[PDB]
Structures are given as structure tokens and as C-alpha cells.
Amino acid sequence: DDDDDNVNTEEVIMNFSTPKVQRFLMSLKVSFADKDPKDICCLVFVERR
């Protein structure tokens, strides 16, 4: 597809993941696009170890 391994990493993550993973990481990106790291404080919960 391309040689830029950074955007390629983004692209493969978007493509080599289930719609659940894609959607979660999508929401994660849009919720904290360019806010101050200090201003944000978030948790993510998952089931299995």
C-alpha cells in the first residue's frame, strides 16, 4: 500500500483489526485529538487478563 511505516502502522491497525477495535480506537482518537495531556484523565476497562 505504501512505505511510510508510521501512517502504514495506523492504516494496518485500522485494517487488521475487528470493527470493535477500529471503532474503539477511532473514538479514542476523536475524543482526545489535540488536548493537553494534563487536562485529560481517562480509564479503559477490559475483561480478560
Partner: protein, 49 residues
């Protein structure tokens, strides 16, 4: 845990599970309402088993 003001809570479920999960969450919210109101109205003088 989202104890701050304007806190945002996020959930992820499959499309096929949408009706089941939303009905379950309504069960949960109505259970919260039920426990709250039943505790409020229920008045017991003995206050001890």
C-alpha cells in the same frame, strides 16, 4: 469512577447485541430507581434485625 463533573462514559457493544444490552441497561437504571425509591419510602421503626 468517572467522578469528575462533565465526565463522559463510553460503552462498546455489537450491533446484534444492541437491543439486549439497552434493555439490560434499562433494567439496571430501573433497578437503581427502585432501590432508591424503596429505600426512601420504606420506613422501619426498629432499624435493627
Amino acid at each position: 469512577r468517572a467522578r469528575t463533573t462533565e465526565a463522559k462514559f463510553v460503552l462498546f457493544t455489537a450491533d446484534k447485541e444492541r437491543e439486549k444490552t439497552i434493555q439490560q441497561i434499562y433494567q439496571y437504571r430501573k433497578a437503581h430507581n427502585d432501590i432508591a425509591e424503596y429505600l426512601k419510602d420504606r420506613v422501619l421503626e426498629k432499624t435493627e434485625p
